[PDB]
Structure formats: structure tokens, C-alpha cells
Amino acid sequence: SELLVNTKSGKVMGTRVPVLSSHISAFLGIPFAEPPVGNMRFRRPEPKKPWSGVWNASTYPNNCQQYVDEQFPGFSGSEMWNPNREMSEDCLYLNIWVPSPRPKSTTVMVWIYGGGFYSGSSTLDVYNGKYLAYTEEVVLVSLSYRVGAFGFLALHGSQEAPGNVGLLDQRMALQWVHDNIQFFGGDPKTVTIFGESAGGASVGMHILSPGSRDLFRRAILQSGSPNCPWASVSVAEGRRRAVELGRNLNCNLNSDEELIHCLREKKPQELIDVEWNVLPFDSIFRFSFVPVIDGEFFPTSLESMLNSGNFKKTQILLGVNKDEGSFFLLYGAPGFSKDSESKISREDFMSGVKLSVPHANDLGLDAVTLQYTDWMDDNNGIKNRDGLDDIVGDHNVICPLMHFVNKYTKFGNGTYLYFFNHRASNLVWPEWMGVIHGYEIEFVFGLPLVKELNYTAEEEALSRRIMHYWATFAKTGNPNEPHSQESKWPLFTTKEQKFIDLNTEPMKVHQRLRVQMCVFWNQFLPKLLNAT
Amino acid sequence: SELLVNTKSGKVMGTRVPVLSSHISAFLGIPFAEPPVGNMRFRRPEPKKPWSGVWNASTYPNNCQQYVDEQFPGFSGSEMWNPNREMSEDCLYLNIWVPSPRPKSTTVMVWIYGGGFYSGSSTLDVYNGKYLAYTEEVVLVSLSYRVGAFGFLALHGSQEAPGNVGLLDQRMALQWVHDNIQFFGGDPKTVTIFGESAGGASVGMHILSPGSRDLFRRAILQSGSPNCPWASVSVAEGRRRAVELGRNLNCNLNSDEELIHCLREKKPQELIDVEWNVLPFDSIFRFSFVPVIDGEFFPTSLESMLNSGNFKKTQILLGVNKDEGSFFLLYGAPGFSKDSESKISREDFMSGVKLSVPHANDLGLDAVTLQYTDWMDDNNGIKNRDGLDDIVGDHNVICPLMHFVNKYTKFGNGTYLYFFNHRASNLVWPEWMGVIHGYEIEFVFGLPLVKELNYTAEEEALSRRIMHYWATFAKTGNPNEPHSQESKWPLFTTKEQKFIDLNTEPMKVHQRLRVQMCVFWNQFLPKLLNAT
Ligand SMILES: C[N+](C)(C)CCCCCCCCCC[N+](C)(C)C
Ligand SMILES: C[N+](C)(C)CCCCCCCCCC[N+](C)(C)C
Ligand SMILES: *[C@@H]1O[C@H](CO)[C@@H](O)[C@H](O)[C@H]1NC(C)=O
Ligand SMILES: *[C@@H]1O[C@H](CO)[C@@H](O)[C@H](O)[C@H]1NC(C)=O
Ligand SMILES: *[C@H]1O[C@H](CO)[C@@H](O)[C@H](O)[C@H]1NC(C)=O
Ligand SMILES: *[C@H]1O[C@H](CO)[C@@H](O)[C@H](O)[C@H]1NC(C)=O
Structure with a gap:
């Protein structure tokens, strides 16, 4: 059976799904970790215990517990980013879209969602990988990871809540892909990880972290960078925030064991209720529980790692949207x-x-x-x-990314930089918000090929063009077709600093992305x- | 006799000079101070002792002792600014151009030359007042003042070399005009002082100084401002420079009397030879001996005087050139x-x-x-x-002037601001220097009406237009003709901040002169x- 696949963790049974008047196979809700519940809250993830019999992988899993944006109740612009499944701490699952017939050894792409490290789901309409898998003949995986305090509470020195466990969740999914994707027709030594915002910073973080480097071949970062000022905090500051969280929940504070024990007795929603109260300043684009510069996952400061070339040296493709700040x-x-x-x-x-x-x-x-x-x-x-x-947008996204780009390119093996500046014609957010944070994703995932979603023909053409760049890059380390002629996306160098626009207009080439600012x-x- | 005028200082005899196929009267080299020589070097000026008989005022006087620019020997671009008469410490004289027939009580304009407070002459071809006097029917006076160490050596506390004596020279000339100009047909209560660069800063300085305010009605500042960073130094810094000058000339330094006595034995050229050696830094647009913030001439800091409105409240007209820095x-x-x-x-x-x-x-x-x-x-x-x-240009001229303008206009009775941006077609300096520091003066003085000097017809039209603005303003406090219609020069307000271009193109109006910078x-x- 094409829907039955035998893995090192056990047998799984997928479901045949329709896509663009055709069909492919989908394996949804496959566990890659022990449910991090009870005494395991805040701990490192454990590998999933192998199971006997057949695991039903025909429906999406639960989403991780998180803050839910109710700023605009009933508004699809905001609600499309909210959890669309039940929330639960038992949320460490991944999803795989596989072409039909099953391939033998083809390019794999692993999606890592964003959401400020405080929110996100693998299961959103906009992250459905079937269109990309079908159109570009790739195995599309999307993983999950703990967010909020659950994923990023940091009391450095403790082993019960060391910090970065959300990032270790991502690594464990990647380990599982490296070990098992071959049984789904995927090629484990041609895996491209890619993500947006916090997902793109995470991608950068696995590039930096020695423990993650061997689990993927290349990377795509969308509107996110490991060095972003919002994406990491010091050990001292993680500690302060964790202690302040306990202070909000009436916890005993005179030791870590006391503090953590108390936080574990709390229901999930109690942690979420006060999560925003621990920020040090009145601020925007800052999130409470984020990765910590712990000396383990990141052996030293991000900046010194970047200066010394202490990172995976491969090909990358990355970029930003015109109006990152408006949200x-x-x-x-x-x-x-x-x-x-x-x-x-x-x-x-x-x-x-x-x-x-x-x-x-x-x-x-x-x-x-x-x-x-x-x-x-x-x-x-x-x-x-x-x-x-x-x-x-400059402070939080573009300029951090340009600093990453410039540093990476000195030691890396190929950089390709884009500036996405097309506003989708069917966007429900107001005009002033421009080309909004997060709205290139739908182009990357091929939603404009679906007529019911009411994109223009020009937007379908752009989406196909983007999917082909992404997938071709994933396959080869170069977004360009070996033989073709509709403007090559030129390589980014230290000297010339070339990048491309991504829009419906005929593609032109520029240099020195927002260098002045x-x-x-x-x-x-x-x-x-x-x-x- | 039209050339014989009886003054409070004594009788003077002028000379009939030709101008634009007509003639007017000129009284050149009229003394207004005792020759500040010998023991009077560095001292305040004394009023000229009245003389009997007739003073021959038919030829220009000597120029004050000063550094001579020999950077481009034989080059008219530079040499036109050099002394064109013998240099001498006996240099405190003024010049007067009077219309023919002599008027009864007409508008007076007093020119104060620039030259960084280290150089300058009343006698330059380009400062000949006959064209302005003839064309606009004004009495045109040009004064002289000591420059360099002679005019601005500052050892605060001493009465032998207090500082600012060059400025007191200017005041004494103005006193002499206030007392005597009526005998030349001038109206002493309608006197406009005007100057360029150091001359324009000097104008500003008499506006500020209580001892000078009563000696003129209104003012024009060209490319210069009292608050310019080059135009004044502290008492401490004046002292340091004076002591350093003596150190260069092997002087006894253990007291002021010793120091000053030594400096007085030196020939003039010895002082000039080492004048540039006392600057505190490697720098441009900085001059060794300039006005000092002494608590007498300027009762307090320039900035506090400007904030408190401690200054003469009248009408002013001022502006700058496009490329002040290039020199x-x-x-x-x-x-x-x-x-x-x-x-x-x-x-x-x-x-x-x-x-x-x-x-x-x-x-x-x-x-x-x-x-x-x-x-x-x-x-x-x-x-x-x-x-x-x-x-x-911004640091030294435009932005200091805009700060003066904005401060003055809060308490003053009328401001008119110009931006001069026409490059003269017959300029011998290279193109890169643009619209050069000092090259609006020739337009202000009417040289473009002389065909032999090879200006264009459009430049004659601009020069007449400028002379009429200057003179009309001198007469009325407003550059505009009561009844006419070729674009009114609008008043500068705090709110709207309007100014005009001065060029050959049809005059347009702008706002907020280089506000960003x-x-x-x-x-x-x-x-x-x-x-x-
Ligand atoms: C302290 N509280 C409870 C008040 C506010 C937290 C909710 C505001 C979310 C901040 C991030 C802005 C972007 C949200 N987007 C993109 C997700 C819709
Ligand atoms: C230290 N020394 C002897 C070398 C140089 C002093 C002579 C340089 C003059 C500085 C002012 C520049 C403008 C000169 N202009 C406008 C007057 C021709
Ligand atoms: C990437 O690596 C290959 C093989 O190691 C090398 O030949 C090539 O020059 C590199 N390309 C870039 C763009 O750095
Ligand atoms: C100048 O002063 C006069 C009379 O004192 C006054 O009426 C007028 O408003 C003032 N004009 C300006 C532009 O300040
Ligand atoms: C999971 O697959 C089973 C077959 O074992 C199927 O009956 C069921 O519909 C699936 N799960 C659901 C509907 O939640
Ligand atoms: C000054 O005027 C006298 C008349 O007393 C005249 O002879 C002489 O030419 C003038 N001065 C000169 C030429 O230096």
C-alpha cells in the first residue's frame, strides 16, 4: 500500500488527499517525541517510544498550547494564524506530503513555522504542503515545537528547565527526518529547512548550533534571522523573566526546584494568562520566552560565532518583505x-x-x-x-538579516537574497499596512493556484515562479534552472551585493538592500x- | 564747491569720479581714528584729532597690515581679494560715494568687509560703491578695521590689549558716520550696515552689542552670522593664542605687560609670519585672531543674548551662497x-x-x-x-545663519532671507567650486553693469534687481517696491520660513532652507x- 509506510519508530498509515485535480499522499500527525507532559514540562524532549501496530496518520494533530490572538474576533486576516485544532501539551508531531507515485530519493523541504516563539501551528491552511509537493515533486515536511514558557522558559543551571527546549523539539524532528524520510521516498542528505520570522531565525539558529548542523543540507530564511534583537535573550534575562512568571503565579521563589515545581502544577492557560507581564519594557516586536544564549546550544555569543565562521557552511536563500513593521x-x-x-x-x-x-x-x-x-x-x-x-521593519527584520547575510557570505558557499514587495490583491488587512509580515508564505506554498481563493492570474504566475526557485534551490543549491532564460537570480557577493525583487512586474536586479538605513x-x- | 565738505573733524576735499557715462562725488581716505601705532598697537581706537585746513580725500588710503594670499601668484581669482594699496598700521580711514548733485537727507549704507578677521580692504575693485550710490541714489560708505593680531589679540584683564579693538574700529567709523554723514547729504537715522562673511558676522555683532546698537537703523548680513563657530573665541582661548604668539616670537611670557611690550617692538610682518601657528587644531575655516566673548562688548554668551532677546530689534535682510565651503x-x-x-x-x-x-x-x-x-x-x-x-558650508555658514535667523525673528521687526545660487559666467575659478563664497558681492555692488567686465545681460538684470532690493530695504525696511508686480520677496516667519532664490531664472519661493541638515x-x- 502507498499509504502504508514502515518507519524505525513503527508503521504509519497516511491518507490520499486531492490537489489541483490530482492526488498525493499525506501522513499527518506523526509523533517524533514523547508527549512532554507532567514532570516533563519545560524539560528536553525525549525520542518517541517505538510503537507496534499501525499509527493512524490521516488527520492533523493537536497544536501546542499558546496565546490566541482575539484582537479581531471573526476576522480572517488574524484568525488564519490562530490554532485550528485543539491545543494540548501533547503537540510534538510532524506532517509529510508525499508525491504519487511515491518517489525513490527526492528533495526534502522541512517547514518551521513562526509566531514570535509564543505561537504557531503546523496545521494552518496556509502551511498545507500538498501544492508544493505536487507542483515541484518534493517531500514536504512540517514540524511542530513548543512555544511560550513551555518551549522557552530558561533557568540556566537547572536540568528541569534549561532553556531552548522548543529548539531541541525542532532538532528532534529533524533527527527523525534524517533517520526515517527515506521510507517516504525522501532523500535525507538533500534536506532543506525553511521558515518565516521566528521560523527563519530558528533556521539560522540550527545553522549556528553544532548539534543541529549535520541534520540538514541547506536553508531558507524568510523575514527572520538568528541575530534578530527579539529572537534571543541572555541567561540572566531569561532567568529574570522565569522568576517574574512565578511571581505572577504566586510561586515559591527561593530556589529553582521550588519555582519549577510550582510552574508545573499550573494549568497551561494560567501560564499563558500572565505570559506578557514579564517583558522588561513597554515595547513592540518583543516576546517573553525566546531562545537563550546558554553556552550549550549556542557555544558563544551569536556575533562572535558569525565573526569567526563558527557555523554550517552551505548555500542559503533568504529575504524580507517591504513592510515588516506594520503588524x-x-x-x-x-x-x-x-x-x-x-x-x-x-x-x-x-x-x-x-x-x-x-x-x-x-x-x-x-x-x-x-x-x-x-x-x-x-x-x-x-x-x-x-x-x-x-x-x-528595519530594526527588527531587514537590518539584522543584512548583517547576517554579510557575515554568512564571507564563509558560506552561496547566498541568494530576495526582496518581496507584492501586496496580495485579496488581502483583507488595510492598505496602509502595505506588503505585510507573513504574506509571502501563501505564495511560497502555492495557494494562488487555487481559484476559489481569488488570486489574480499574475499572482499564480508569481507563486509558481517562487515555488520553483525555492524547490530548485532545495535540490541544487541554486534557484536558477541550469538551462533557461527568464532572468537569472544572481548570487549575492560581499562586493556587488545583488538581490532580486519578487513581484508580478518583470523581474529587475538591484544592489545594497537598504544600505543607508x-x-x-x-x-x-x-x-x-x-x-x- | 560740491567736492568740499565741512565736517566736525574738519574740512575734506573729494574728487569727481565717472560712473556709467555719468559722474558722482567721492571722498576717499577720510580718517576716523588716531593712527593706532607705536604704544597704541592692540589698544582701543581713539577719535581722530580735528584738523585745520583741507584734508585731501581724492585717493584711496593704505590698507591694514595683513596676511597676503600668495597661493596662486598672478591669478586674478585670488589676487582681487588681496590689498591693492600699501599696507600700514596707519589704516583707519573710510570712503564715501555721494550722488551728484549732493542730496539733502538720503539713505546711507555702510559696508564692512570680510576676510576671516585676518584680512580685508575697503579699497578693492569689487567694493567700489560708485555704481550702487549712482544707481540707487544712496550715500555709500566703506569703513576699515584692524585685522589679525593687530585688531584681535585678546588678553582679557589688560587695558593695553583687551580684545575686540577691530570691532571698536568699526564702531568708531559708525560713530563718525552718525555724527558727520549729514554734511555729505546722508540721513544719519537711516543708516544700514552691511557686510560679507566676517563682515556679516560683524554686522550681527553690532546688533548684539549694546555700545553699537544706536549707531545704525538696520542691517544686512551676507554669508556670515555672529554665532558662526569661527567668528569668536572664549577669553581663555584668546589668552592662550596671544601667549602662543609671543612664544613664537621669543617673547618674555611671565606677565601681560612683558608680553605686550615685546609684541609691540616687533615689526608688523613678524607678527603675520607666525599668525597661523597658534590654531589649536589641524582645521579649515578657522582663523587665529577673532572677536572674544569678553563680558564688555558682548555682555554674555552669544546664545543667551539670542534666547533672551538681548539685541537690537529692527529689520534685517540676510542670506547665503550655494557653495560656501569650496574655498x-x-x-x-x-x-x-x-x-x-x-x-x-x-x-x-x-x-x-x-x-x-x-x-x-x-x-x-x-x-x-x-x-x-x-x-x-x-x-x-x-x-x-x-x-x-x-x-x-553648512557647518560654518548656512546652519549658524539659520539659527541666528530663527532666534532673531522671534524678537525682530522684519526678516528677509535669500539663497544666492547663480555662478557668474566670467568666474576664473574651476567649475567644481560652484557658487563660491564671496561672489554675490560683485552683484551687490553693480559690477555687472560694466560691459568691459564681460558679464551677460541676464547678469546685469540680476545685479540691478539685487541692488534695488538692498537699497530699497535700506530705505524702508522692506526690499519690495510699495507698488510693483514682479514677485514679492516674502517676509520670513517662524511658522512658514519662506525665502527666495537669487539667480537669473524667474524668481521662485521656497521654505525651510536646508532644514534637514x-x-x-x-x-x-x-x-x-x-x-x-
Ligand atoms: C500584552 N498583551 C496581552 C496585551 C498583548 C499581546 C498580543 C499582541 C501581539 C503582539 C505581536 C503583534 C503581532 C500580532 N499578529 C501578527 C500576530 C497578529
Ligand atoms: C597656515 N598658512 C600659512 C599655511 C595657510 C594660511 C592661508 C590659507 C587661508 C585659509 C582660508 C582659505 C580661504 C582663502 N581664500 C578665500 C581667501 C582665498
Ligand atoms: C562552493 O563549493 C564548491 C566546492 O567545494 C566550490 O568549487 C565553489 O567555488 C563554491 N561556490 C561558492 C559560490 O562559494
Ligand atoms: C514692526 O513694528 C511696527 C511698529 O512698531 C508694527 O506695527 C509691525 O507689526 C512690525 N512688523 C513686523 C513684521 O514685525
Ligand atoms: C483514522 O483512520 C481510521 C482507520 O483506522 C478511520 O476509520 C478514521 O476515520 C480516522 N480518524 C478519524 C476520523 O479521526
Ligand atoms: C590730492 O589733491 C591734490 C590737490 O591738493 C592733488 O594735487 C593731488 O594730485 C592729490 N593727491 C595725489 C595725486 O596723491
């Missing part, structure tokens, strides 16, 4: 609302800056303001709004803050 | 030469910045570099050259340097 301003910054065009006064602009750069002393805030203010017309609400949008964020501002 | 880069900055287009490498750009902002710590230099560098194309020698040009120089950079 976080709508949710947090004063003046912004979903149903107005959110023209921002000078007052709200100043408030926005402070929220965007929470560490900054006054001089730093002045430096940012000066850099993003048109003083010929500083009461223009459109320019204030768009300028804040740029501040948030990123020199500000990567060179000047940190030196200003260091000297004051 | 000082040619003379001092590496990479720049007169006979090449002076494309500047990244190395020379960094060297240039440091010379332009000599106080700055490393972070300040970084801030300036970032502000004036196109990082999409940072090896472009044209942009590096032009960017340095802008740095020097001047916010950098006036608000941000000083706050950065203060906090580091």
Missing part, C-alpha cells in the same frame, strides 16, 4: 487602527519610536527620529506612519548607545 | 586642487571631515559622515567632493558631543 504597530503603537488609514501625529510618532527601540537613551531616540523624519514636512501623517513602519542600525546606533 | 577645501583639504575637478577618494573624504569639525570625537565624525554619505555609491568622487563642500548641525550633533 506590530497596529497591535501596539498608539494612533494605528485597522479601519482607518492611521495617519500619525508627531506625538504618536515619538511614542512609536520609543516603543520600537526600548533600550535607547534619549540621544538614541533622537538619532532614530532624525534618520526617519522629513523635516520639510514633519506633520505629514502619511510620512510619519510610513516612517514608523520602516523603523520597526542598515548602516545606521548596524554600525552607528550601537556605537552611539555604547559610548553614552 | 576652504581648495586651500586646506587634501585631494582638492585648482586645475583638476577634485574628485575625492573615501580617504580624503574622511580627512576632510576631521578638518571641518575639529572638536569632534570619533562618534561625532561618524555622525557627520553618515549624514553626508550616499552609501549606495560611496566611492563616487563627485559626491564625496560635493558632500564635503556641503559639510563645510541644519537640524543635524544645530540640534543633534551638539547634543551628541555634549553627552559623550
